[PDB]
């Protein structure tokens, strides 16, 4: 048997050497050239176990990701357990590409093709591939952007549903796009738009694939975030270089018993770091139209719990691991022998 | 995450305190 393996994964990309903009500059040290000639090979009569959270392609994925960052992004001031570091902070051109995880020789990337497929146990149609599908490496909160789509319905995914502590991964199968702009010529206000019938439609299909998880009797609600930091509030995200915090209460203020949903959001300067424990100051935003748009492919849930007869979810997110994972959990690494 | 600024935080909001990450999170 092939059993799943640590190895030294390589990345491709479609990386330009002529772009300035970080993830290529990024891309054309770290990646080798996209693959010019895939081979996916269908496996037969075989059954493989996979477990999208216990998965090493996510913290190799998570590592490089810190890398990109901590090369590009370069914050004015920076506090660390007590230290204080100063630097130049150069503003950047900031747009994420795709980028593909390979094994090197000895190893083999399995993937699992069951459409209905919740993560974790056998897998019935699987087959190997040189290298994983193009991933843009988004770091987000509460919503998914840029992801791939769920093939046939909406997929949910939890490492433990009964664990209320357990982050609920969805997966849309159908994108819901969500333009952030920062007009041209106060600096740091924002807004977000996205259609209000395609949120709403988007809302009560999560809520019927969660009452299939936690019972048809089950009264689901939504809710927006309990508190904590500014960036598991919010809809937080980067753009253009330029972190933006959403105020997300009218996308998760909803229960079963308008033409655009318009969202406020603020560009801070001063914001809590994801690869490590730490703040980070840059300087302030640059001038002109600033804008994004994005599709939604996936939420980030968690659920009350306790007690009774009431489910209540709220916008999680906050371990980026997760964001990979919502894109790596069809893939494990084995090694051929 | 730094749980107990944060556990310090949320308590203060009525709630408790929990890491997401390296962010502090209430429940
Ligand atoms: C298995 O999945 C692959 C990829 O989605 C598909 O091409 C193939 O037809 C499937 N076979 C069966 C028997 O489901
Ligand atoms: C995932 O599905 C398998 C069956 O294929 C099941 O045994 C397992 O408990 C499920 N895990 C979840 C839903 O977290
Ligand atoms: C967004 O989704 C649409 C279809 O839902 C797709 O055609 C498009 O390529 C996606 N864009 C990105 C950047 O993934
Ligand atoms: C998306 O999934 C939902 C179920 O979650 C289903 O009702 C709908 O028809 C699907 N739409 C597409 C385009 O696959
Ligand atoms: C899922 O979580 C619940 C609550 O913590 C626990 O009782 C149960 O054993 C877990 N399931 C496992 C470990 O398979
Ligand atoms: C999003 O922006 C596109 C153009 O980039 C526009 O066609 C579309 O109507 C916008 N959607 C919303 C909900 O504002
Ligand atoms: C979120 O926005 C709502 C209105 O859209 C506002 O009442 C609320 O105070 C805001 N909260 C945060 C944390 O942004
Ligand atoms: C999503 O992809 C589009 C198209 O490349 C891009 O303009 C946008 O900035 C991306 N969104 C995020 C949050 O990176």
């Known amino acids: ?337 | 995450x730094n749980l107990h600024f944060c556990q310090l935080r949320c308590k203060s909001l009525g709630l408790l305190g929990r890491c997401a990450x390296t962010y502090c999170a209430c429940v």
Request: proline share 5%; charged share 20%.
């Open chain 1, 1 to 337: 048997v092939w059993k799943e393996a640590t190895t030294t994964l390589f990345c491709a990309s479609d990386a330009k050497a002529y772009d300035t903009e970080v993830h290529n500059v990024w891309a054309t040290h770290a990646c080798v050239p996209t693959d010019p000639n895939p081979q996916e090979v269908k496996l037969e009569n075989v059954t493989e176990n996979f477990n999208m959270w216990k998965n090493n392609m996510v913290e190799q994925m998570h590592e490089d990701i810190i890398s990109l960052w901590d090369q590009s992004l370069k914050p004015c001031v920076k506090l660390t357990g007590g230290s204080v570091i100063t630097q130049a902070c150069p503003k950047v051109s900031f747009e994420p590409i795709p980028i593909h995880y390979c094994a090197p020789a000895g190893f083999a990337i399995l993937k699992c093709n069951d459409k209905k497929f919740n993560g974790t146990g056998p897998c019935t149609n699987v087959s190997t591939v040189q290298c994983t599908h193009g991933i843009r490496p988004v770091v987000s909160t509460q919503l998914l952007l840029n992801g791939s789509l769920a093939e046939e319905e909406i997929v949910i995914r939890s490492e433990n549903f009964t664990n209320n502590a357990k982050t609920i991964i969805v997966q849309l199968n159908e994108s819901v796009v969500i333009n952030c702009t920062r007009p041209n010529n106060d600096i740091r206000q924002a807004h977000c738009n996205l259609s209000k019938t395609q949120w709403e439609n988007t809302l009560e299909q999560i809520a019927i694939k969660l009452k299939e998880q936690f019972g048809n009797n089950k009264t689901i609600i939504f809710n927006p975030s309990s508190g904590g930091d500014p960036e598991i509030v919010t809809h937080s995200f980067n753009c253009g270089g330029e972190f933006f915090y959403c105020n997300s209460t009218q996308l998760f203020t909803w229960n079963d018993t308008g033409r655009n949903i318009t969202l406020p959001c603020r560009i801070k300067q001063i914001i809590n770091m994801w690869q490590e424990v730490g703040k980070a100051m840059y300087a302030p935003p640059i001038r002109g139209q600033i804008r994004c748009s994005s599709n939604i492919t996936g939420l980030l849930l968690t659920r009350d719990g306790g007690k009774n007869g009431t489910e209540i979810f709220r916008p999680g997110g906050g371990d980026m691991r997760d964001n990979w994972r919502s894109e790596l959990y069809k893939y494990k690494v084995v090694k051929i022998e």
